[PDB]
PDB file of C-alpha atoms in Angstrom:
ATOM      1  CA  UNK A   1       6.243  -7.341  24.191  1.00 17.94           C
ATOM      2  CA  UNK A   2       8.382 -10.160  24.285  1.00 16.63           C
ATOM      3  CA  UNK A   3       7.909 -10.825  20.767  1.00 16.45           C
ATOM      4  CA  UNK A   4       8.777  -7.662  19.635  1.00 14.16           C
ATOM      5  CA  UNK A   5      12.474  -8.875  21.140  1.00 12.45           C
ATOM      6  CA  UNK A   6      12.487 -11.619  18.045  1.00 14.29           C
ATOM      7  CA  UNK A   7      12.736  -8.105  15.531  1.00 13.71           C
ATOM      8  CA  UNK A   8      15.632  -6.086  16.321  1.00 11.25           C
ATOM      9  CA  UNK A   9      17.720  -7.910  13.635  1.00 13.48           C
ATOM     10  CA  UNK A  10      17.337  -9.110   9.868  1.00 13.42           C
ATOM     11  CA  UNK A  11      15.047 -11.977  10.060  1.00 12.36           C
ATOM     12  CA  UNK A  12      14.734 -14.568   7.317  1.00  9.85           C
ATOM     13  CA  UNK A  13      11.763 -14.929   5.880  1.00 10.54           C
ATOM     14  CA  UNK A  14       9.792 -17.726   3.607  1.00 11.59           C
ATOM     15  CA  UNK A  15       6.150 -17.331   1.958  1.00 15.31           C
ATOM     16  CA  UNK A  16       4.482 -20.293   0.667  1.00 14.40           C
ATOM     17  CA  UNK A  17       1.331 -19.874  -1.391  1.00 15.69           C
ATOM     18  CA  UNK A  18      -1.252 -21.946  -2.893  1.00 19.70           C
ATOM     19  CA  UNK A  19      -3.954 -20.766  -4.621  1.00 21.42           C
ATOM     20  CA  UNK A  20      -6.940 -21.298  -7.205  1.00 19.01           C
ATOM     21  CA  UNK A  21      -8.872 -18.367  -8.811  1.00 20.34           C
ATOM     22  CA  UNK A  22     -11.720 -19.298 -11.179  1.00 21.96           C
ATOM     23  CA  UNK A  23     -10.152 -23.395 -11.328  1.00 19.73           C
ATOM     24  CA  UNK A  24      -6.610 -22.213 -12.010  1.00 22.48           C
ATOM     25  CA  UNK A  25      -4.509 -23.685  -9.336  1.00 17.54           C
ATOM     26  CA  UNK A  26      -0.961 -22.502  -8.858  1.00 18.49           C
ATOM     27  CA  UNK A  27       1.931 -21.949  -5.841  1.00 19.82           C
ATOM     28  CA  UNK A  28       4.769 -19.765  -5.381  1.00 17.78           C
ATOM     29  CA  UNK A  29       7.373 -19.431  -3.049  1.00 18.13           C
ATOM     30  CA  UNK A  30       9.080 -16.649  -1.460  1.00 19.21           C
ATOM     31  CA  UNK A  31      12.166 -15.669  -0.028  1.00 20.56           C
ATOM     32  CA  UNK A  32      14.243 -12.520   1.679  1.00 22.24           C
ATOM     33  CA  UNK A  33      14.645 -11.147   4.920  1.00 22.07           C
ATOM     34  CA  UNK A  34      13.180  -8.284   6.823  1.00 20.90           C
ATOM     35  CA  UNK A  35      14.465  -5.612   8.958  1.00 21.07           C
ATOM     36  CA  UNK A  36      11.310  -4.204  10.947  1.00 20.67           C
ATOM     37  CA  UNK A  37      14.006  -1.382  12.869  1.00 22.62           C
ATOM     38  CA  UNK A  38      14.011   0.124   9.559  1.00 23.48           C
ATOM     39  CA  UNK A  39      10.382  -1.441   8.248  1.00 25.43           C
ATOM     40  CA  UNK A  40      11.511  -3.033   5.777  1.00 23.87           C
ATOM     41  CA  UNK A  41      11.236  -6.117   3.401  1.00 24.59           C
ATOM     42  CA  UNK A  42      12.809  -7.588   0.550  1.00 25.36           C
ATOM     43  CA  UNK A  43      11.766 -10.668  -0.941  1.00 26.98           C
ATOM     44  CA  UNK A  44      11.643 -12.752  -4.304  1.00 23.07           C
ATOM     45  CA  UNK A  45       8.734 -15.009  -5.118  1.00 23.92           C
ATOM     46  CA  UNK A  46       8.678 -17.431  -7.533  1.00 26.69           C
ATOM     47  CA  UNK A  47       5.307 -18.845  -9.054  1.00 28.55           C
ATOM     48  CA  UNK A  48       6.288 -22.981  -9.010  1.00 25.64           C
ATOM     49  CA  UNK A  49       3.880 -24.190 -10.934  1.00 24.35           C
ATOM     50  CA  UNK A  50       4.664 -22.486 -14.515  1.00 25.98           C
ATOM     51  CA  UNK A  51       2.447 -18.919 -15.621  1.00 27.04           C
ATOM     52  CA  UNK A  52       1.267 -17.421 -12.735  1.00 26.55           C
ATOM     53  CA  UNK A  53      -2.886 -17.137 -13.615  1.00 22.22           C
ATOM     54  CA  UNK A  54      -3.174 -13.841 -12.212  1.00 26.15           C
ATOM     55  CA  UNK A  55      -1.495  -9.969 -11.914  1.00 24.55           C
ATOM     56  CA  UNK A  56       1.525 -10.561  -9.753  1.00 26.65           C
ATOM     57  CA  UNK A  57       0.919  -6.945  -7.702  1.00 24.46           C
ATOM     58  CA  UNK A  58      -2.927  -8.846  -6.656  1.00 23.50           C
ATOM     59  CA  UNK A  59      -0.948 -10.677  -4.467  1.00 22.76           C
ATOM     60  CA  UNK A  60       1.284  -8.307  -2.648  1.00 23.30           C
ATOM     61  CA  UNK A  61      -0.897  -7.776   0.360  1.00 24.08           C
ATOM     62  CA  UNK A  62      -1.544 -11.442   0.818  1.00 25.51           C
ATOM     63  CA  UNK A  63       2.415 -12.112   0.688  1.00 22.48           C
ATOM     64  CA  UNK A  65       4.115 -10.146   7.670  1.00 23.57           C
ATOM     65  CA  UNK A  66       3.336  -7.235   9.138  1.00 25.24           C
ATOM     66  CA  UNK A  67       5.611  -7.849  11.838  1.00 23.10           C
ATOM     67  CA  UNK A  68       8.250  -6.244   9.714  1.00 28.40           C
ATOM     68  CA  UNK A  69       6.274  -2.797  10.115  1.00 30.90           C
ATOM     69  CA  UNK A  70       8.435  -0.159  12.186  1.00 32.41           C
ATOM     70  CA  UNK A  71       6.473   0.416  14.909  1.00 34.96           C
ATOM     71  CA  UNK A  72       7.612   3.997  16.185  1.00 34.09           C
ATOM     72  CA  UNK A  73       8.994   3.286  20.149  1.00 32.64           C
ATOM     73  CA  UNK A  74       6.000   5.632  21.580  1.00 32.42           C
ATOM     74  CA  UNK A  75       3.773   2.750  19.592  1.00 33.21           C
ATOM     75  CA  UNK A  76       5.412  -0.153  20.870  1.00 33.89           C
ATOM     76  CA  UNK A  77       2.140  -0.941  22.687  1.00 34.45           C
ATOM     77  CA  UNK A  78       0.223  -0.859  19.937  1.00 35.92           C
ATOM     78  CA  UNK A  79       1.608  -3.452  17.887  1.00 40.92           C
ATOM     79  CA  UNK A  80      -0.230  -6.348  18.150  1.00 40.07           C
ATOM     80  CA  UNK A  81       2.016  -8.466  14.758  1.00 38.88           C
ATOM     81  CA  UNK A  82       5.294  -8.841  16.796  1.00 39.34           C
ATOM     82  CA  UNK A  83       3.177  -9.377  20.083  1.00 36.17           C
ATOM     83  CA  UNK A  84       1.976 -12.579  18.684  1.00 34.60           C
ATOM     84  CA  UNK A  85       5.259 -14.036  18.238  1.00 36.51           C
ATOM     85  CA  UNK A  86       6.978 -16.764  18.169  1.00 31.96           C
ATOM     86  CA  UNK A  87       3.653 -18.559  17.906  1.00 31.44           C
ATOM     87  CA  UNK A  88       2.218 -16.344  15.266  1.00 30.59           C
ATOM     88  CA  UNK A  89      -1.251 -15.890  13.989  1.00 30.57           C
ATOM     89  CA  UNK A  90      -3.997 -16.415  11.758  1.00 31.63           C
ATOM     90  CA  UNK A  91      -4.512 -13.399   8.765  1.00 30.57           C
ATOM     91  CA  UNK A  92      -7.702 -14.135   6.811  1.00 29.74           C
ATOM     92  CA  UNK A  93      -8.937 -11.709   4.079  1.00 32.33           C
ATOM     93  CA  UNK A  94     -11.455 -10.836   1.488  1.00 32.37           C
ATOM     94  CA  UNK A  95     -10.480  -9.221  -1.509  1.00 33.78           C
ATOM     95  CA  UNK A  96     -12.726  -7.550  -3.493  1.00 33.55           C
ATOM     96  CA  UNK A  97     -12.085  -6.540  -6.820  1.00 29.67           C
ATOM     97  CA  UNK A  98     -14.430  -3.793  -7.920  1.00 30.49           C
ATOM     98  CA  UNK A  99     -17.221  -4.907 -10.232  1.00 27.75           C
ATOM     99  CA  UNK A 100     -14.845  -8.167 -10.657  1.00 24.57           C
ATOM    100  CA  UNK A 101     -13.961 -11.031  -8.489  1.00 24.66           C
ATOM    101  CA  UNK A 102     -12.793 -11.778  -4.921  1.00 22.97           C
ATOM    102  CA  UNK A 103      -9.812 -13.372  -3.220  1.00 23.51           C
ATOM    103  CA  UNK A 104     -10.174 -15.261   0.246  1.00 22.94           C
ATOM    104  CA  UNK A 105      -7.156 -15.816   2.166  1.00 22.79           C
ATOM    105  CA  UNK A 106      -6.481 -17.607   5.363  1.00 21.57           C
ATOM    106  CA  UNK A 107      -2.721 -17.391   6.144  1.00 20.93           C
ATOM    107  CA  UNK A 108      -0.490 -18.288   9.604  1.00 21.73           C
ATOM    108  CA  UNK A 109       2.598 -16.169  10.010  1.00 21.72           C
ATOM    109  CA  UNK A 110       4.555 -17.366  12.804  1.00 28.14           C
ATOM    110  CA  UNK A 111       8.848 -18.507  13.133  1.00 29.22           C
ATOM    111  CA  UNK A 112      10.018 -21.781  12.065  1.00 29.70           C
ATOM    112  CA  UNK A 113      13.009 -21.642  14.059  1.00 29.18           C
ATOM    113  CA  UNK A 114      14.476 -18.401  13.823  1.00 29.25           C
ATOM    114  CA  UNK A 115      12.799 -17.690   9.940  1.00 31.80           C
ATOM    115  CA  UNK A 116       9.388 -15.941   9.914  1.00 31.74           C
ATOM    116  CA  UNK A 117       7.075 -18.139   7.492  1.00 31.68           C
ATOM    117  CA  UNK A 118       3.709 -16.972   5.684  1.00 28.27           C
ATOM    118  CA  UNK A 119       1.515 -20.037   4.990  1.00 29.03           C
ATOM    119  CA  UNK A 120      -1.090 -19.259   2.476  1.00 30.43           C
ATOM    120  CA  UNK A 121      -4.120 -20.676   1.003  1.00 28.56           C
ATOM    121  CA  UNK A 122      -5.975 -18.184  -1.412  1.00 27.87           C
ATOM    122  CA  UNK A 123      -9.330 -18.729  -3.178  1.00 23.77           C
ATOM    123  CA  UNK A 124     -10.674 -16.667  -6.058  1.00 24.83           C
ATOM    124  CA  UNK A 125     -13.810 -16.655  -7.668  1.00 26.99           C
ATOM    125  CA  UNK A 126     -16.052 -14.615  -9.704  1.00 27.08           C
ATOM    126  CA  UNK A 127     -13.331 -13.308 -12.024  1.00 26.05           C
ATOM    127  CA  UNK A 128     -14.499 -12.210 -15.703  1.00 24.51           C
ATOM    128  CA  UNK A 129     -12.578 -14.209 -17.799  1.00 25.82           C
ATOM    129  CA  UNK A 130     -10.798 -11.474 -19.596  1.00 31.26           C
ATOM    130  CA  UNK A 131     -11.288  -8.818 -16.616  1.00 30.55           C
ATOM    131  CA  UNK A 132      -8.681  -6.731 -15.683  1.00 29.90           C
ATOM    132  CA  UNK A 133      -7.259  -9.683 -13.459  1.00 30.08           C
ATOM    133  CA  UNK A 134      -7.825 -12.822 -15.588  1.00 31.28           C
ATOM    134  CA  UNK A 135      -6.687 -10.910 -18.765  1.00 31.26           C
ATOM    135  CA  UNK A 136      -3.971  -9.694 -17.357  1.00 35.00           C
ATOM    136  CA  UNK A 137      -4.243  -6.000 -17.657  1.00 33.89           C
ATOM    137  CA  UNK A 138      -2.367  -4.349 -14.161  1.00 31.39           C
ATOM    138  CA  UNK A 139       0.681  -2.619 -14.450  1.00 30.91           C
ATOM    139  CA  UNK A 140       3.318  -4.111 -12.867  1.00 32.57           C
ATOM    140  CA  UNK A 141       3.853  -1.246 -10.141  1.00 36.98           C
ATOM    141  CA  UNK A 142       2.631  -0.683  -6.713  1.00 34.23           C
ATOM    142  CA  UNK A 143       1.278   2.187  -5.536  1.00 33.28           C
ATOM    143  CA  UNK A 144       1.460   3.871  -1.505  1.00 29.54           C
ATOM    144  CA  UNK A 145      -1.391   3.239   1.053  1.00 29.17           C
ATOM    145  CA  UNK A 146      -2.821   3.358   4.418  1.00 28.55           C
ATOM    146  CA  UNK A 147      -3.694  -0.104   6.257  1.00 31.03           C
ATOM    147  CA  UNK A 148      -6.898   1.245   9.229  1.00 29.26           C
ATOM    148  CA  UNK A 149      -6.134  -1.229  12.006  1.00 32.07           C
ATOM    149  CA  UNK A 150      -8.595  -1.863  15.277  1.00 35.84           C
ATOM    150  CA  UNK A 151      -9.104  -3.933  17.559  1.00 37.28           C
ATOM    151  CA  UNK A 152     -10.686  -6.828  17.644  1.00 37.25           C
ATOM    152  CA  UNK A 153     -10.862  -8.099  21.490  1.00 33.94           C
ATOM    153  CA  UNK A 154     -13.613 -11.250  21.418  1.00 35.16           C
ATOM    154  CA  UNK A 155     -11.004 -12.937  18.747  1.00 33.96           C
ATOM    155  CA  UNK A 156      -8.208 -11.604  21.089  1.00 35.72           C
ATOM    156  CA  UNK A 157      -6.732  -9.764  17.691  1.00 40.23           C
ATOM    157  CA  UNK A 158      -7.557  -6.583  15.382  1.00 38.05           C
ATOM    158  CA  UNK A 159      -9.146  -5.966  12.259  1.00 38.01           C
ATOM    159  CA  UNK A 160      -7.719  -3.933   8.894  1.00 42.32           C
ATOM    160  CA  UNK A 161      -9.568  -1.914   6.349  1.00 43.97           C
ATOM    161  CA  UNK A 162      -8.214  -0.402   3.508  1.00 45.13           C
ATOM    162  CA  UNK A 163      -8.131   0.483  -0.436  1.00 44.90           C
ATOM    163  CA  UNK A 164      -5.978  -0.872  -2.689  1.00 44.34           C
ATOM    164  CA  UNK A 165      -5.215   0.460  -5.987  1.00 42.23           C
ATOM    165  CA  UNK A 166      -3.808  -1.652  -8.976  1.00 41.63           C
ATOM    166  CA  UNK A 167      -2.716   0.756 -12.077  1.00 43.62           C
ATOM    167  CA  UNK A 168      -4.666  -0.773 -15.123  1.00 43.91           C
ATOM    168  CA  UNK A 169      -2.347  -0.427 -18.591  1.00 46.42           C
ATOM    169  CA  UNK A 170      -4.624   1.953 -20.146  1.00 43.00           C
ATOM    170  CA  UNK A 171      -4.111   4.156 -17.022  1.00 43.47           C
ATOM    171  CA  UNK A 172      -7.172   3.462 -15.268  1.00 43.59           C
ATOM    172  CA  UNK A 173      -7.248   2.070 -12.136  1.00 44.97           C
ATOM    173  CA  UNK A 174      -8.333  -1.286 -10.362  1.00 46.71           C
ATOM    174  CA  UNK A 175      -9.987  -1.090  -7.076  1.00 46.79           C
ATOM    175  CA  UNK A 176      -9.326  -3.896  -4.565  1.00 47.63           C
ATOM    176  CA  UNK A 177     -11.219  -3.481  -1.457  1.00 45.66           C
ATOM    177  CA  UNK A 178      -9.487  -4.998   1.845  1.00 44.89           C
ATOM    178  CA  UNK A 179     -11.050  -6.533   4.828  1.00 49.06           C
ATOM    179  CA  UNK A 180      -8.537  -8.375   7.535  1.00 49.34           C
ATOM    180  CA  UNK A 181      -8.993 -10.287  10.369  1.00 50.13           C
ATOM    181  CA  UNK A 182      -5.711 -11.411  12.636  1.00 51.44           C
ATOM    182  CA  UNK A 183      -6.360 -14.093  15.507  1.00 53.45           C
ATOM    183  CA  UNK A 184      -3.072 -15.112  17.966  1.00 53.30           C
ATOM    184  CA  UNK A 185      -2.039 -18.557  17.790  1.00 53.52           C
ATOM    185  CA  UNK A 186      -0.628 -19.049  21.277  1.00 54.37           C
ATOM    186  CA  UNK A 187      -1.122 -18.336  24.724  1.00 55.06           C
ATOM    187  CA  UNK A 188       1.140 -15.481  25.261  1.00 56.07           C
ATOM    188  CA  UNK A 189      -0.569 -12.048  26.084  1.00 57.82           C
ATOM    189  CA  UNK A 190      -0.797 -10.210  23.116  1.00 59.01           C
ATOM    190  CA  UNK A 191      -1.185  -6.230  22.547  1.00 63.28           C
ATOM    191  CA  UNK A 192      -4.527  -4.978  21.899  1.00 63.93           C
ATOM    192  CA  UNK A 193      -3.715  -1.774  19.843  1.00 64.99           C
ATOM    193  CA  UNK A 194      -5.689   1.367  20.003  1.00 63.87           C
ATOM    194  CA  UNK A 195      -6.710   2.850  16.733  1.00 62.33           C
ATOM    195  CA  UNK A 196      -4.002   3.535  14.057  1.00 59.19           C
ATOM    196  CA  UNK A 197      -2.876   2.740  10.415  1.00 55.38           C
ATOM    197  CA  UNK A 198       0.512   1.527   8.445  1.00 56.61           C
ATOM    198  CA  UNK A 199       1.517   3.625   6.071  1.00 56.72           C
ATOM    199  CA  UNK A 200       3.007   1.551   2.864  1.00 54.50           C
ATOM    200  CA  UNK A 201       5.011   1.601  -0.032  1.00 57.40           C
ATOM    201  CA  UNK A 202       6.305  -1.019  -2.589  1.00 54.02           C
ATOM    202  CA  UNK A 203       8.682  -1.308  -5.578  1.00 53.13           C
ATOM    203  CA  UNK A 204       8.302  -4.057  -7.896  1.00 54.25           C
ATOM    204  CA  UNK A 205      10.741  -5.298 -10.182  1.00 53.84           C
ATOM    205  CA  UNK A 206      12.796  -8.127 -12.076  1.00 52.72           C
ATOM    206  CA  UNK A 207      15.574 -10.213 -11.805  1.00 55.02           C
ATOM    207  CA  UNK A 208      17.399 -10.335 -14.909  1.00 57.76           C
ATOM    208  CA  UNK A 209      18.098 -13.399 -15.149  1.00 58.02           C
ATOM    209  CA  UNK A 210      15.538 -14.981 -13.809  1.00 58.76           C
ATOM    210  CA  UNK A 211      13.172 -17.054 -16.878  1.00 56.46           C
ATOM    211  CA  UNK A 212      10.665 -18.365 -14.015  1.00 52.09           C
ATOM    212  CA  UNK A 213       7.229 -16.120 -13.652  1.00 50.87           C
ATOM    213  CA  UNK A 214       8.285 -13.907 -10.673  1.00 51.52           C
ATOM    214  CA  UNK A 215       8.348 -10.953  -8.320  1.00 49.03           C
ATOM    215  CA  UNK A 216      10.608  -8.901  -6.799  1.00 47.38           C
ATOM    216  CA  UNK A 217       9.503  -6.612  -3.912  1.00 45.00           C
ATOM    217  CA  UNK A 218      11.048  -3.996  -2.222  1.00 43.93           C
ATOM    218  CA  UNK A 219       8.556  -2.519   0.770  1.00 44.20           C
ATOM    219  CA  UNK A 220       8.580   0.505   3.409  1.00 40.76           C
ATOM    220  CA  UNK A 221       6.011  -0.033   6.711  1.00 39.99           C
ATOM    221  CA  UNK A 222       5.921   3.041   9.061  1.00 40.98           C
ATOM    222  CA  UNK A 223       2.867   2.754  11.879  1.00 37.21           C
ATOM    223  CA  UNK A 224       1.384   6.178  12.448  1.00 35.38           C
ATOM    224  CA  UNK A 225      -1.916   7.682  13.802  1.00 35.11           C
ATOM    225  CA  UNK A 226      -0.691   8.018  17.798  1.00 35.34           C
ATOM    226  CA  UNK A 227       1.460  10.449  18.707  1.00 31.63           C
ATOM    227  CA  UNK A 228       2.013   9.449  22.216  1.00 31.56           C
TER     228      UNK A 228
END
């Protein structure tokens, strides 16, 4: 695609989030750069607003899978950089098993020559001292597989997949995914056959950093098609 043109190179990227789970309203903002060649990402985010209300790892998945490395043999499959410059619309629901859900609508598209994710996220239905309200993730991220399809009346794709947040007494929070993506512009975009993203994430601190924050380090490899 043309858009996939816009990747060969460290992009900029910003995040901006605004949220309220259960009546606790907050932001953050994000910053770094990604590096799809390699699938890569590296961002800080920085909850604005004071405390941030909930787990900082919830949040991950809702913080541009543009940056994914699409293998060459895939290029056609990759429907994220297809979209671009123009972007498009990511909307999710999150569920939390036997706990709340997030829903997110987000548009990902450049600013210029800086990718941007614009967020709004809703929560409700948390249990006030649940493992997400109380506070009770580890701060750690584990590996996964993102199912993407396509999704040809919206003119986009679909995602399915399992997320698992560590809890700190070694258990382990389920957070269901469901994903819809939906180009912005009139460009033609790729309409990928079945195939998944294979993920992983580091997450970690700046030292001297005293705001509530994040520090992400993430790995995107497409697979599923071998020709």
């Amino acid at each position: 695609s043309k858009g996939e043109e816009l990747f060969t190179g460290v992009v900029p990227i910003l995040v901006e989030l605004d949220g309220d789970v259960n009546g606790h309203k907050f932001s953050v903002s994000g910053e770094g750069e990604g590096d799809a060649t390699y699938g890569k990402l590296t961002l800080k985010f920085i909850c604005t607003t004071g405390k941030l209300p909930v787990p900082w790892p919830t949040l991950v998945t809702t913080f541009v899978q543009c940056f994914s490395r699409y293998p060459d043999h895939m290029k056609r499959h990759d429907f994220f950089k297809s979209a671009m410059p123009e972007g498009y619309v990511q909307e999710r629901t999150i569920s939390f098993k036997d706990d709340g859900n997030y829903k997110t609508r987000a548009e990902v598209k450049f600013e210029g020559d800086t990718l941007v994710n614009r967020i709004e996220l809703k929560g409700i239905d948390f249990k006030e001292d649940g493992n997400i309200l109380g506070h009770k993730l580890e701060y750690n991220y584990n590996s996964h597989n993102v199912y993407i399809t396509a999704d040809k009346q919206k003119n986009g794709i679909k995602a399915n997949f399992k997320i698992r947040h560590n809890i700190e007494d070694g258990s382990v929070q389920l957070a269901d995914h469901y994903q819809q993506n939906t180009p912005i512009g009139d460009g033609p975009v790729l309409l990928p056959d079945n195939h998944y993203l294979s993920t992983q994430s580091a997450l970690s601190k700046d030292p001297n950093e005293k705001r509530d924050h994040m520090v992400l380090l993430e790995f995107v490899t497409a697979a599923g098609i071998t020709h």
